[PDB]
Amino acid sequence: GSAVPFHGAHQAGIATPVQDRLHFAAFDVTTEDRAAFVALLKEWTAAARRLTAGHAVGEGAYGGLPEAPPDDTGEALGLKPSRLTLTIGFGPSLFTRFGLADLRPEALADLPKFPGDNLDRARSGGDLCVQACADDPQVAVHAIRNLARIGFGKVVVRWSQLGFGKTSSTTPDKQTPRNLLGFKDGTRNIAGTEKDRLDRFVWAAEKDGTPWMTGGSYLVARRIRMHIETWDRASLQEQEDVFGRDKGEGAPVGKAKERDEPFLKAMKPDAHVRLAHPDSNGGATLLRRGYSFTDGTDGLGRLDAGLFFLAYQRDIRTGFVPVQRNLATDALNEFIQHVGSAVFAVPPGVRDADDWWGSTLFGK
Amino acid sequence: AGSAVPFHGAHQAGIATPVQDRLHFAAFDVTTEDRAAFVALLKEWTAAARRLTAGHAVGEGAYGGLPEAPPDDTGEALGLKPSRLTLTIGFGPSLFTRFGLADLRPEALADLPKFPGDNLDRARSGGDLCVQACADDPQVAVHAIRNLARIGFGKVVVRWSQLGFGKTSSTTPDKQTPRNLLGFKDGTRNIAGTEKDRLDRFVWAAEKDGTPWMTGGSYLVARRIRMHIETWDRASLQEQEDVFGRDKGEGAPVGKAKERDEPFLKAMKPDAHVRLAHPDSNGGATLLRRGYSFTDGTDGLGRLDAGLFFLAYQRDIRTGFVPVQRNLATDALNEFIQHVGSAVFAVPPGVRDADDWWGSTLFGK
């Protein structure tokens, strides 16, 4: 497939097929005028309509008046849409502006402090987020970079994160991707094909108390480093004890195939799978849509790499929070450290060529 | 199709090879003083490079070993294709201050002069040796550097690394020329992998140059260049085009109509980037540029921080990067870029067969 439809009852980039690359970015609002903001959201929408179809924003990247800066920076010229999806989310701090306090959804709870947290405030939070996912990373980077240029004067970029998963051009789509620890990551997850589960664990409903979120979701972002050098020193058995599956095939303890249903009582008490399993959390279930990241080498010469964890849910208090809390005694905690965090209320979708991002929240 | 690039040859792969879509560059610093210990590491690295470039796990594998033993391969590449992985090794001038290699530091491995406008981070510059990991799959390149580093534990350390999310170079003039983050095509007039007479003239060293052990190798100049994205995106279309000498949409030289139409340099502004970099403007000095675009989060001040990891292979740095870089002192592009990291490496000749090993010509075999 080449492109994903931008319009719909929901926003693309949540339930849709997971793309290869990612450029996440959290924005901070720098304007007080609500009409100027609404105007940006419409300009941003019009630009995303062009970005997700492989076209240049505005009037184009060249050919215009020579004395005028081009509307598009043009580093996407000659590339394909690449399954580009642009998902916008509203964070708690946004609702303290424009008189939106009383409309902040109660499902957008602030995350509590979890044991072991070492969050970098500079790389945390944000008034807005754009999740740019595509098979080609330059198409993602081009979209964030142009969306930031468009909104310059009304929004800035708080933090940005590049990620990567599979290379679909060479990796089969049905092959589970492996995280940087060497384990198949994503076996037991909510797929976008399961409309009944999405209606129960991901999408927000009107009765949930916030009508303007009817059709939207709530996103949780966690930047989790991995102690690559120590993990590579643990024995194969220790490694498999941590998760409760075997590294080669990814199968649960006592089973032969990856996708067999696990038998938790055979896993060690502090195994990752055993604790994060829904049965172990009053039925809490998540849609994990994260990416691996590798930013380079830190001061101490260690690999600055990990998982950019993303999770979509119908309510943050019945999704990420119960599950993350249960991971207090995770044996994986020895080899990981959360260092970035933010949450967002992702509104419903752009219904047609007249609608615009956040039209249910800001009205018409 | 994720096919593999042959690891053996008279030269190392990753130079004249078609530019791959991802990069993981890593400079190392030698910790051990034992010359026999380092030579052994070189033979261990070479063995792992044969496995990785072929799409196989290093050592005895990623699993199946003793449950009490750590796996030889970290396993994050299992189930992936070679993805055109290349691993190119280089020796830095600081490596010759040890193991008794002083008399073998190649004269062509010239230490760069101080260029005006530079603000080089010394912690992200230099290095006793380098390993260039290029591939169409980023998890493959990373998996390669990580496992090479783990094998060299106790004998080498990573000084700095640099990941390239996208190529800004081309050794294949027949394929689409990629674009840097300034929106312009980058790699139009560059040495192609099929142009042997030019590769022999500008890239591959020779025993006549004075360093026999470097016959068949090349010399690398790495330069981390930050881009002032904010000031560039304020310029007009005509200013951006006057900066380089080519138009933006087609990439043709000024006045012309097609990207690969040869330039008429007198029609460009006297400070046009193309006009000063052209070989005709540098006594015929020609480079083999093989760089990648990079992103580094945000400057912490509300702005995306991005740039270009510039790599240049040449037969002799004194006649390649140095003269061309000096001619860009007046370059109009200088008002939008800044060089913030730098390193040079003497890339030895390639691994001939399964009995050879990286740096065998230098260290004797």
Ligand code: HEM
């Ligand atoms: C670096 C950090 C992490 C790593 C390496 C990791 C890795 C894994 C692996 C290998 C599995 C088994 C394969 C699979 O079922 O997908 C798994 C399962 C799972 N993980 Fe994680 N995980 C991390 C963090 C988290 C966090 C922070 C959460 C939630 C707050 C989470 C929630 C889950 C869930 C819900 C499952 C499904 C288990 C089941 O239902 O059987 N993970 N993870």
Ligand code: HEM
């Ligand atoms: C951020 C820094 C740079 C950018 C954005 C940049 C961009 C470009 C562009 C757009 C072209 C024209 C298309 C092409 O011929 O590929 C070009 C050509 C060229 N550049 Fe640069 N460049 C940069 C740095 C450098 C440096 C540091 C050197 C050498 C020390 C260099 C040497 C050359 C050469 C030799 C050419 C080909 C000129 C010819 O047509 O003969 N560039 N570059």
